[PDB]
Amino acid sequence: VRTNGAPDMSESEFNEAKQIYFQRCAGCHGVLRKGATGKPLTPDITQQRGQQYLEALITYGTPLGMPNWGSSGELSKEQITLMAKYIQHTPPQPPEWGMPEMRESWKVLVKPEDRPKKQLNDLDLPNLFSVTLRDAGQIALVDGDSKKIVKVIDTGYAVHISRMSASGRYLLVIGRDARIDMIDLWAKEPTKVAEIKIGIEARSVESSKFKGYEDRYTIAGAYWPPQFAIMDGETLEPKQIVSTRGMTVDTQTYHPEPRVAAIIASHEHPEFIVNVKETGKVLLVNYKDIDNLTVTSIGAAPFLADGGWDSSHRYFMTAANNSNKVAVIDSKDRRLSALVDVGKTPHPGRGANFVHPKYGPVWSTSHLGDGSISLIGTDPKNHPQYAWKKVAELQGQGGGSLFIKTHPKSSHLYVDTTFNPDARISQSVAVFDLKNLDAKYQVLPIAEWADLGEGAKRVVQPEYNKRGDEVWFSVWNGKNDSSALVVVDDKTLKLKAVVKDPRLITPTGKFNVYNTQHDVY
Amino acid sequence: VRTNGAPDMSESEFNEAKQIYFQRCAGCHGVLRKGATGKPLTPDITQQRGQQYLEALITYGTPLGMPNWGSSGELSKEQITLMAKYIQHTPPQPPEWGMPEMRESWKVLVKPEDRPKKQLNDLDLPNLFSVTLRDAGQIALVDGDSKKIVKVIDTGYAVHISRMSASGRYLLVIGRDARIDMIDLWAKEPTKVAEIKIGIEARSVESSKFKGYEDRYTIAGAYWPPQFAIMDGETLEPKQIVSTRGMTVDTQTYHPEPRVAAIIASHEHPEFIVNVKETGKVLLVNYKDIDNLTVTSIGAAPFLADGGWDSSHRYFMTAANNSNKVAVIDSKDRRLSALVDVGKTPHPGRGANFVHPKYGPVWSTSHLGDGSISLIGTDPKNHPQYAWKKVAELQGQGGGSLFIKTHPKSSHLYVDTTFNPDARISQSVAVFDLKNLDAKYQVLPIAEWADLGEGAKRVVQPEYNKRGDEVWFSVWNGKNDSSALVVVDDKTLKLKAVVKDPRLITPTGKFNVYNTQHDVY
Ligand code: DHE
Ligand code: DHE
Ligand code: HEC
Ligand code: HEC
């Protein structure tokens, strides 16, 4: 084993590092090391740094995300030297991940027969918040009423998102390394009952949400290998694995590695909606019969990204990279209803739904560059003159917002500005009065409200509670600085509570059980 | 360009030979040259023969199938030298074949608007026979009544099979090189109206046979690339191309190159039944909406082969390589009804259906090794005690039969013995009296009946006429020897006609329009 410019090693050293890479590093550094979360670790870059620089970085780690492998004792001094050597060599082809490997990683910590037949705690589960602790590598269960952290669960290092099972009993979390952990909220102390790994890199997970199929199936989509898997919603046992490799929608030529951009459970039929990126296809995977799977392939647009349901939960509004068009998927009739041409490039996400006084039910989406927000009619039944058209456009504080949120019981539309260049703006949120949209938004000083007075204090993601009278926001501040969660009374737009705890390490995503379980947005 | 032991050439010579290989040679020699029709052309084999031996073979060709490229003027002296060099080098990875390449090969010789609005000839089309001329590289249209060759159509060199469109107007032929030719039987002189190439190697083609979809779609499945394509049943315009790459049914691990073993048009729903070999999956491709394709993936058995419909045309009886099990696919309910354990390994084919006096409707299949024939019950509605079970076993003359055939209006079951070691037996056929199956078959001296007195005079494939009172057989005898077609009166089991013509070069497959159009067997 010799690559063109750094440390010759060999085969009982290469394959060892290789194993560790795909199992412990690819989650953030990319399967081919082109990078994702972490920076790219290609040869040219790694060589210039030199063996020593590399070992220091791996052992100690950076406070901006990179774990410390030596200090934590996760890896050995000898192993860290192999990795430093390994990353300087040409990147090999990533391994496949089939049934043997999935079953290998499948572990049931608590058999279904040994789980509580009912809810063994006093927790108000529906108003619980599953807050992601980005750098701490875990999730925090926060009581929506007592406003205190109820339980801290260790997930992994690349904790990405949380999802709920249709019964409201199971908390599902996935990592960017394709590891999934199942949590039973009915135990004395809510805990992990099962886990499994479905690939090398992943971003999606969802449960069966069609009536009658509560807790029947759990699906997860990967970046690598190009595939998605359906597991038993009760034990996480891997049932079927499907490849997303195939022909593109535009050029209709073969594509060797299409990534699963997003997944969403359908309400119209017993099926999962899978967005495949490079091929531009929205797959409808029917799970009425898992032994003999039925899949409908809906051509949309190239480079599919994320999306969300319209108010009725029938039309899936989806964005595409480098495209000002929102592909509308009819999940009932299983077809492409439209390619709505909004102004600029829509920012990938669930979006926000509300009833515009003048236009009826609309679905909105923000624009990263100028902070504007596009509205689209989503009621062809009673408002056909507006259905599937950019009906209007709002204006926020400015650039770089990551989330927008509203609620059926609320009269406000909250929109952040996390990545705005102006520090002041990135520390606040805009609140739109849906009753008077001709008015300018109001600016809520979220960061000023906890109290922290240090760093960037980035403010991210508005999330309501079960009722719809409270709105929570995370107040970032990296590992060793101090973080908090701010709560506002939606009816009064006044501060209501500030959550602090030495355990609230870099809180980001917040998932209210009920609102996640029922797709309320 | 240097391979480890023969003629260094280079790149403007390599790529040229490479192009010619995949376009003109891969049809018979295999995409990786492992061989199929023709012998393998791998380096070790090609090197031992030496440049000179190779050039001689390519230029002159063998009478056992191999075309003469120099003599015919198809290739040049200079080009034949490159190929000789090319085949001695390590085999490269085969090219993909997407939409651009398919449209490139798509040629409409006669626009649909310019075709006759009605039948412009006196031909009795339903009783027409499309006889494959193996070495001559063409098909012969033979009148089922006048007993004379009505038209000879040039198809290509690897003419494999013929199929009919549901209207009975279009004759479809496919080559092992994935080239398809469409023939309009309504013209003054029946002729080609369109052609297209769908891959490098292929064996399957079929038309839409569900009521209402006459001439709507034509599908073709390939060996390489692993894909199938659906084209416009009127112009052969390529509409959709799907990849068969994916996970296996047994080990559920990724397979980079699964071949389409067979295709069959469904009668229960508007869908095509595609058998994928290595992954062991029976795909139900619904064409109600071609823009948004629905596919049901039925797991069967590993290494799927060919099959045929049961009498009702609802259950698809399919064989698998190295398996004594026949997978029964319910095409209505879209599931696997059974894995019938017949004795030995069933020989892949359509099979033969008839009503067994004691067991009711049965589907039969032969066994290459001992010439036995297995029977299986196919009526769970009125004979559930026999449905999906080896109900009985017949005995033929012996080893190596390729076809068995019966007909609803006939009381006989004809079975050949083409590859039997005993020359005498390979020149005859067995006729079973379905009214008395406890009796021994009768031996019809097919070869003795034309008159030829030379070579092996191999006898192959029993095919009835539109009525069901005649049974045709081909009487092989290679290129330069003399061939014929023998016809027997089914009601009398006596000779009825011998067809001879200097144009009947090595006749093999015979497809009666009506029986092919309606899947009568
Ligand atoms: C495609 C995708 C989904 C949909 C999954 C599904 O369907 O189940 C999703 C959803 C999500 C959702 C879903 C809930 C919602 O608020 O709608 C949230 C909050 C979330 C928290 C974050 N993720 Fe996520 N996330 C990515 C990908 C995705 N994020 C990235 O690759 C990206 C852009 C870069 C990265 O690696 O960080 C990214 C950044 C973030 C964040 O910045 C967040 C806010 C903070 C964090 O914890 O990393 N991801
Ligand atoms: C998988 C397959 C099909 C189904 C196609 C479809 O679904 O549309 C089929 C059908 C067929 C059918 C279908 C009709 C029938 O009689 O049922 C026939 C007669 C036929 C004439 C032949 N083919 Fe065929 N054929 C192959 C493959 C196949 N043959 C081979 O690879 C094989 C075993 C070896 C070879 O390359 O020759 C082969 C030999 C033959 C023959 O020996 C025949 C009899 C003479 C010839 O012309 O080559 N093929
Ligand atoms: C995400 C959960 C990570 C995992 C797992 C690993 N790395 Fe990482 N790494 C990550 C980030 C976000 C960064 C950037 C750190 C920053 O604050 O700038 C890094 C950085 C490194 C480097 C970068 C070298 C440089 O460009 O300065 C190296 C060489 C590195 N990481 C190696 C590495 C290895 C070998 C890992 C597995 C054993 C590993 N990382 C895991 C995030 C994450
Ligand atoms: C099928 C329609 C064929 C096509 C097209 C080509 N070849 Fe062929 N080839 C074929 C057969 C059936 C055989 C065996 C001939 C026999 O009677 O034994 C061959 C043989 C050759 C050989 C074989 C050398 C040997 O082992 O003796 C060579 C080198 C060869 N064919 C080359 C070749 C090339 C280069 C072609 C395309 C330009 C080509 N064949 C096409 C059948 C068919």
Side-chain angles (χ1 to χ4, degrees):
Chain A
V1 185
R2 308 168 161 198
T3 214
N4 308 301
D8 307 280
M9 57 209 295
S10 296
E11 208 131 333
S12 260
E13 294 181 285
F14 183 71
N15 286 303
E16 180 185 348
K18 182 178 179 175
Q19 190 63 233
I20 299 165
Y21 183 80
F22 295 117
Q23 288 295 305
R24 296 191 174 95
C25 316
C28 303
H29 285 282
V31 97
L32 285 166
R33 300 204 236 121
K34 286 160 149 47
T37 303
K39 303 167 182 167
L41 296 187
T42 48
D44 46 17
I45 286 188
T46 52
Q47 276 182 154
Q48 187 268 276
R49 306 305 172 73
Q51 177 83 20
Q52 281 302 309
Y53 181 55
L54 300 177
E55 296 177 315
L57 280 163
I58 300 173
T59 47
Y60 302 116
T62 314
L64 293 172
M66 168 58 171
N68 50 330
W69 303 95
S71 305
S72 65
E74 214 58 324
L75 285 188
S76 74
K77 194 180 188 191
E78 284 60 72
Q79 291 180 314
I80 292 173
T81 304
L82 297 194
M83 295 304 300
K85 294 186 181 174
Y86 172 78
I87 55 180
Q88 297 185 81
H89 277 106
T90 305
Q93 269 301 292
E96 294 293 327
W97 194 262
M99 194 58 79
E101 282 101 333
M102 280 191 203
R103 299 198 95 93
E104 147 82 4
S105 70
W106 181 43
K107 292 170 173 59
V108 182
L109 304 187
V110 178
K111 285 187 179 184
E113 49 249 78
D114 299 8
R115 301 175 187 171
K117 322 297 283 291
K118 65 172 181 173
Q119 218 267 241
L120 303 190
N121 58 62
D122 302 0
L123 303 184
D124 177 6
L125 303 179
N127 204 29
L128 216 64
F129 284 79
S130 182
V131 187
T132 311
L133 307 172
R134 190 199 269 284
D135 299 326
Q138 53 197 27
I139 59 95
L141 297 192
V142 181
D143 191 287
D145 296 298
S146 79
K147 261 68 169 190
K148 301 179 185 304
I149 294 185
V150 154
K151 179 62 187 295
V152 174
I153 309 176
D154 277 52
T155 49
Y157 267 132
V159 199
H160 187 201
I161 56 171
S162 299
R163 284 302 190 268
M164 285 302 303
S165 66
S167 68
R169 177 180 177 178
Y170 298 112
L171 201 265
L172 294 169
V173 318
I174 196 175
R176 286 185 299 275
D177 60 337
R179 182 182 272 94
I180 301 166
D181 298 304
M182 196 181 261
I183 302 169
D184 186 0
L185 304 176
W186 284 9
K188 278 285 196 299
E189 202 100 26
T191 45
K192 284 172 58 183
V193 307
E195 61 166 319
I196 196 173
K197 186 177 172 73
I198 59 140
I200 303 308
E201 291 187 80
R203 297 289 183 277
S204 320
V205 61
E206 183 68 287
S207 62
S208 45
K209 289 178 175 178
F210 184 77
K211 190 170 301 170
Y213 297 86
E214 296 177 8
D215 291 7
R216 289 293 294 287
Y217 300 115
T218 291
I219 189 179
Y223 267 18
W224 181 270
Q227 63 181 33
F228 66 76
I230 294 168
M231 300 135 270
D232 193 67
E234 198 80 20
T235 56
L236 279 185
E237 176 181 15
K239 304 303 299 180
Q240 299 284 325
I241 305 171
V242 176
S243 176
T244 53
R245 285 172 164 109
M247 311 308 274
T248 60
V249 66
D250 55 0
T251 64
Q252 299 199 251
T253 55
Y254 180 74
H255 195 294
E257 53 193 85
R259 300 127 95 206
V260 168
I263 295 183
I264 195 175
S266 159
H267 292 287
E268 294 296 328
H269 302 296
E271 43 201 49
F272 288 127
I273 314 295
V274 183
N275 271 14
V276 189
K277 188 171 295 293
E278 293 76 6
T279 56
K281 291 176 178 180
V282 183
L283 309 185
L284 301 216
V285 192
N286 195 289
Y287 52 81
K288 184 175 187 175
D289 190 0
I290 40 169
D291 304 89
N292 302 324
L293 236 41
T294 299
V295 182
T296 297
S297 199
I298 304 169
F303 292 99
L304 284 171
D306 209 359
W309 284 129
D310 83 279
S311 49
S312 72
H313 288 202
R314 193 234 273 227
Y315 304 94
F316 182 50
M317 325 294 294
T318 181
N321 299 322
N322 301 139
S323 179
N324 62 353
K325 311 186 179 310
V326 172
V328 181
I329 313 299
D330 188 333
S331 74
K332 182 178 179 177
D333 283 24
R334 301 183 174 88
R335 60 182 281 280
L336 172 67
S337 295
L339 290 175
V340 185
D341 183 344
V342 290
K344 318 103 206 197
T345 302
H347 183 68
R350 302 208 222 297
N353 294 294
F354 62 90
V355 180
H356 189 305
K358 173 178 172 53
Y359 306 106
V362 301
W363 175 81
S364 51
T365 184
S366 66
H367 295 87
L368 201 65
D370 63 24
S372 72
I373 306 167
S374 286
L375 312 195
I376 303 173
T378 68
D379 188 16
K381 196 191 307 299
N382 302 290
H383 293 90
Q385 65 284 13
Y386 299 137
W388 320 135
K389 308 177 189 300
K390 184 176 180 178
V391 105
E393 195 196 289
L394 302 176
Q395 247 307 147
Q397 302 192 63
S401 142
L402 285 53
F403 299 96
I404 60 180
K405 194 60 82 76
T406 178
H407 189 289
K409 304 287 184 181
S410 173
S411 65
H412 302 126
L413 162 71
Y414 302 81
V415 11
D416 60 23
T417 22
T418 316
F419 291 163
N420 184 275
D422 188 274
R424 157 167 287 166
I425 297 178
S426 75
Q427 296 170 339
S428 65
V429 298
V431 184
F432 289 87
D433 179 64
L434 301 176
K435 282 168 149 53
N436 185 13
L437 289 169
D438 303 318
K440 190 188 187 67
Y441 51 82
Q442 286 189 243
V443 175
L444 266 54
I446 304 301
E448 195 174 286
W449 287 348
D451 189 8
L452 305 157
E454 281 151 276
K457 300 182 289 294
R458 306 291 241 228
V459 180
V460 64
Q461 200 240 345
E463 176 82 348
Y464 289 77
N465 63 338
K466 192 281 189 73
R467 300 181 193 94
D469 53 27
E470 291 184 355
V471 185
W472 297 37
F473 306 82
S474 299
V475 181
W476 218 335
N477 219 330
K479 195 186 185 67
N480 307 285
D481 280 280
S482 189
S483 300
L485 301 183
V486 178
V487 186
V488 187
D489 191 296
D490 171 65
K491 297 182 175 303
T492 68
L493 295 182
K494 201 167 177 64
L495 175 60
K496 179 170 181 176
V498 174
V499 184
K500 287 184 187 174
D501 190 291
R503 295 173 289 174
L504 195 69
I505 282 75
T506 71
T508 51
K510 299 178 298 302
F511 300 88
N512 171 250
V513 172
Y514 188 93
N515 298 347
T516 298
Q517 176 193 33
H518 291 278
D519 295 319
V520 193
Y521 57 83
Chain B
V1 185
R2 308 168 161 198
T3 214
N4 308 301
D8 307 280
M9 57 209 295
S10 296
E11 208 131 333
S12 260
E13 294 181 285
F14 183 71
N15 286 303
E16 180 185 348
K18 182 178 179 175
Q19 190 63 233
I20 299 165
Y21 183 80
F22 295 117
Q23 288 295 305
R24 296 191 174 95
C25 316
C28 303
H29 285 282
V31 97
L32 285 166
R33 300 204 236 121
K34 286 160 149 47
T37 303
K39 303 167 182 167
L41 296 187
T42 48
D44 46 17
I45 286 188
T46 52
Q47 276 182 154
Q48 187 268 276
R49 306 305 172 73
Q51 177 83 20
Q52 281 302 309
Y53 181 55
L54 300 177
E55 296 177 315
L57 280 163
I58 300 173
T59 47
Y60 302 116
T62 314
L64 293 172
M66 168 58 171
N68 50 330
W69 303 95
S71 305
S72 65
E74 214 58 324
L75 285 188
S76 74
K77 194 180 188 191
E78 284 60 72
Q79 291 180 314
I80 292 173
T81 304
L82 297 194
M83 295 304 300
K85 294 186 181 174
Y86 172 78
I87 55 180
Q88 297 185 81
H89 277 106
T90 305
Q93 269 301 292
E96 294 293 327
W97 194 262
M99 194 58 79
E101 282 101 333
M102 280 191 203
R103 299 198 95 93
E104 147 82 4
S105 70
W106 181 43
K107 292 170 173 59
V108 182
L109 304 187
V110 178
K111 285 187 179 184
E113 49 249 78
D114 299 8
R115 301 175 187 171
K117 322 297 283 291
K118 65 172 181 173
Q119 218 267 241
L120 303 190
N121 58 62
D122 302 0
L123 303 184
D124 177 6
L125 303 179
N127 204 29
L128 216 64
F129 284 79
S130 182
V131 187
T132 311
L133 307 172
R134 190 199 269 284
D135 299 326
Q138 53 197 27
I139 59 95
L141 297 192
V142 181
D143 191 287
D145 296 298
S146 79
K147 261 68 169 190
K148 301 179 185 304
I149 294 185
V150 154
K151 179 62 187 295
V152 174
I153 309 176
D154 277 52
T155 49
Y157 267 132
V159 199
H160 187 201
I161 56 171
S162 299
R163 284 302 190 268
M164 285 302 303
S165 66
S167 68
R169 177 180 177 178
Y170 298 112
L171 201 265
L172 294 169
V173 318
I174 196 175
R176 286 185 299 275
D177 60 337
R179 182 182 272 94
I180 301 166
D181 298 304
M182 196 181 261
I183 302 169
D184 186 0
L185 304 176
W186 284 9
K188 278 285 196 299
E189 202 100 26
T191 45
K192 284 172 58 183
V193 307
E195 61 166 319
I196 196 173
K197 186 177 172 73
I198 59 140
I200 303 308
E201 291 187 80
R203 297 289 183 277
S204 320
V205 61
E206 183 68 287
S207 62
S208 45
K209 289 178 175 178
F210 184 77
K211 190 170 301 170
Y213 297 86
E214 296 177 8
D215 291 7
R216 289 293 294 287
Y217 300 115
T218 291
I219 189 179
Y223 267 18
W224 181 270
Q227 63 181 33
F228 66 76
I230 294 168
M231 300 135 270
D232 193 67
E234 198 80 20
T235 56
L236 279 185
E237 176 181 15
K239 304 303 299 180
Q240 299 284 325
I241 305 171
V242 176
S243 176
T244 53
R245 285 172 164 109
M247 311 308 274
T248 60
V249 66
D250 55 0
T251 64
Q252 299 199 251
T253 55
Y254 180 74
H255 195 294
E257 53 193 85
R259 300 127 95 206
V260 168
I263 295 183
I264 195 175
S266 159
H267 292 287
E268 294 296 328
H269 302 296
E271 43 201 49
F272 288 127
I273 314 295
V274 183
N275 271 14
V276 189
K277 188 171 295 293
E278 293 76 6
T279 56
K281 291 176 178 180
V282 183
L283 309 185
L284 301 216
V285 192
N286 195 289
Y287 52 81
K288 184 175 187 175
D289 190 0
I290 40 169
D291 304 89
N292 302 324
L293 236 41
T294 299
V295 182
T296 297
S297 199
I298 304 169
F303 292 99
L304 284 171
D306 209 359
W309 284 129
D310 83 279
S311 49
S312 72
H313 288 202
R314 193 234 273 227
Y315 304 94
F316 182 50
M317 325 294 294
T318 181
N321 299 322
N322 301 139
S323 179
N324 62 353
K325 311 186 179 310
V326 172
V328 181
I329 313 299
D330 188 333
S331 74
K332 182 178 179 177
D333 283 24
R334 301 183 174 88
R335 60 182 281 280
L336 172 67
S337 295
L339 290 175
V340 185
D341 183 344
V342 290
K344 318 103 206 197
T345 302
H347 183 68
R350 302 208 222 297
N353 294 294
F354 62 90
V355 180
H356 189 305
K358 173 178 172 53
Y359 306 106
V362 301
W363 175 81
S364 51
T365 184
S366 66
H367 295 87
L368 201 65
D370 63 24
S372 72
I373 306 167
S374 286
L375 312 195
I376 303 173
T378 68
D379 188 16
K381 196 191 307 299
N382 302 290
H383 293 90
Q385 65 284 13
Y386 299 137
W388 320 135
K389 308 177 189 300
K390 184 176 180 178
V391 105
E393 195 196 289
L394 302 176
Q395 247 307 147
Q397 302 192 63
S401 142
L402 285 53
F403 299 96
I404 60 180
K405 194 60 82 76
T406 178
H407 189 289
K409 304 287 184 181
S410 173
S411 65
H412 302 126
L413 162 71
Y414 302 81
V415 11
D416 60 23
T417 22
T418 316
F419 291 163
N420 184 275
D422 188 274
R424 157 167 287 166
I425 297 178
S426 75
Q427 296 170 339
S428 65
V429 298
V431 184
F432 289 87
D433 179 64
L434 301 176
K435 282 168 149 53
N436 185 13
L437 289 169
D438 303 318
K440 190 188 187 67
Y441 51 82
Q442 286 189 243
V443 175
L444 266 54
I446 304 301
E448 195 174 286
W449 287 348
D451 189 8
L452 305 157
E454 281 151 276
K457 300 182 289 294
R458 306 291 241 228
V459 180
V460 64
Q461 200 240 345
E463 176 82 348
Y464 289 77
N465 63 338
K466 192 281 189 73
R467 300 181 193 94
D469 53 27
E470 291 184 355
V471 185
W472 297 37
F473 306 82
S474 299
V475 181
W476 218 335
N477 219 330
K479 195 186 185 67
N480 307 285
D481 280 280
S482 189
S483 300
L485 301 183
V486 178
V487 186
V488 187
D489 191 296
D490 171 65
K491 297 182 175 303
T492 68
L493 295 182
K494 201 167 177 64
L495 175 60
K496 179 170 181 176
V498 174
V499 184
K500 287 184 187 174
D501 190 291
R503 295 173 289 174
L504 195 69
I505 282 75
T506 71
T508 51
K510 299 178 298 302
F511 300 88
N512 171 250
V513 172
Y514 188 93
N515 298 347
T516 298
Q517 176 193 33
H518 291 278
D519 295 319
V520 193
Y521 57 83

